Amino acid sequence: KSLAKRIYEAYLKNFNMNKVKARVILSPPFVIHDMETLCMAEKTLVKEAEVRIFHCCQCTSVETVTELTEFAKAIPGFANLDLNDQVTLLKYGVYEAIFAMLSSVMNKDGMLVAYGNGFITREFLKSLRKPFCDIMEPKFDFAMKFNALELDDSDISLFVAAIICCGDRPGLLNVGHIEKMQEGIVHVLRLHLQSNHPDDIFLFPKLLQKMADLRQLVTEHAQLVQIIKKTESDAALHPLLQEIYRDM
Ligand SMILES: CC(C)(Oc1ccc(CCOc2ccc(/N=N/c3ccccc3)cc2)cc1)C(=O)O
Structure with a gap:
């Protein structure tokens, strides 16, 4: 699938650090x-x-x-x-x-x-x-x-x-289309995981569990962040990160 090839190349172009590296x-x-x-x-x-x-x-x-x-x-x-x-x-x-x-x-x-x-x-x-x-x-x-x-x-x-x-981030305008985008990417991923990891054909649903865990990991992170914001003076939070966290 060409979509897999583009994303992968985009990722190699754009991330200075990757796993094989x-x-x-x-x-x-x-x-x-x-x-x-x-x-x-x-x-x-x-x-x-x-x-x-x-x-x-x-x-x-x-x-x-x-x-x-x-x-x-x-x-x-x-x-x-x-x-x-x-x-x-x-x-x-x-x-x-x-x-x-x-x-x-x-x-x-x-x-x-x-x-x-x-x-x-x-x-x-x-x-x-x-x-x-x-x-x-x-x-x-x-x-x-x-x-x-x-x-x-x-x-x-x-x-x-x-x-x-x-597709399920709060406040999306065109949800229908973003759902379809995600569907297409998820689809590429599943098939890609099936060809690239035949030993665990259920590796795909495990990654869906990982996604859930990431959402929970991040929620907890933002709280520790909010704690450090209120504990330590001298630990200033970068305005970009602060904007990201705002109402999240
Ligand atoms: C508040 C903040 C920044 O929380 C985060 C904390 C960690 C991470 C992941 C990356 O973590 C790093 C931790 C330490 C690093 N140290 N590098 C050096 C280099 C030289 C000397 C000493 C340390 C590098 C990365 C992400 C977020 C957030 O909410 O963004």
């Missing part, structure tokens, strides 16, 4: 396993260590939104939608996509950061004071079960495309 790397990355190694990484690769780390998260968040936006625009049909719908889908979709794609750079030990040249451990993140330690853990939890599906980039591209073109 991240796996080749994890197969020489710098390891932030402690403060001493944190500071060293802040010398080369990119105020409390905690809020520093947080700020780095926001930077990465913003870059990925930009890339998701550009990826969206390259999805057949997307640019032909009304603007308020292009905005709506992105608004409600970026964080599900972000956390789905975050899985590609996480193993049980930690996650790649600084465009791949850094690696921050899961443990070191958990050692952090509250609530900042509660930020990455649920994402690591999601990632482990997600990576267990062993999707590749050709799968993930379609999965992210489906997250984005989602």
Whole structure:
């Protein structure tokens, strides 16, 4: 199906980091396993260590939104939608996509950061004071079960495309058409999963469960976000991310 080929190529063009790239790397990355190694990484690769780390998260968040936006625009049909719908889908979709794609750079030990040249451990993140330690853990939890599906980039591209073109985001104008868009993408995905993962012909419905879990993961994230907004002064939230979260 040509739709699979376009989305995949759009995803390779638009996402600087992808799974095969991240796996080749994890197969020489710098390891932030402690403060001493944190500071060293802040010398080369990119105020409390905690809020520093947080700020780095926001930077990465913003870059990925930009890339998701550009990826969206390259999805057949997307640019032909009304603007308020292009905005709506992105608004409600970026964080599900972000956390789905975050899985590609996480193993049980930690996650790649600084465009791949850094690696921050899961443990070191958990050692952090509250609530900042509660930020990455649920994402690591999601990632482990997600990576267990062993999707590749050709799968993930379609999965992210489906997250984005989602007929049930609140406030859509042309729902009928967006439903059909999603149907077409979901269709490509299912068949693609059937040819690319014959060993689990029910991998498709499992990914639908993943979608549900992403919606719940993100909801919980926004709450922790709202907590950190009200706890820590010195942890300012980037106005772009703040706009994304507004009335979400
Ligand atoms: C508030 C915010 C930003 O929440 C999020 C938190 C995490 C993520 C996923 C990406 O997370 C990262 C965490 C740490 C990173 N550190 N990189 C370095 C580099 C050098 C030195 C120290 C750390 C990078 C990514 C997404 C969102 C949100 O709601 O957007």
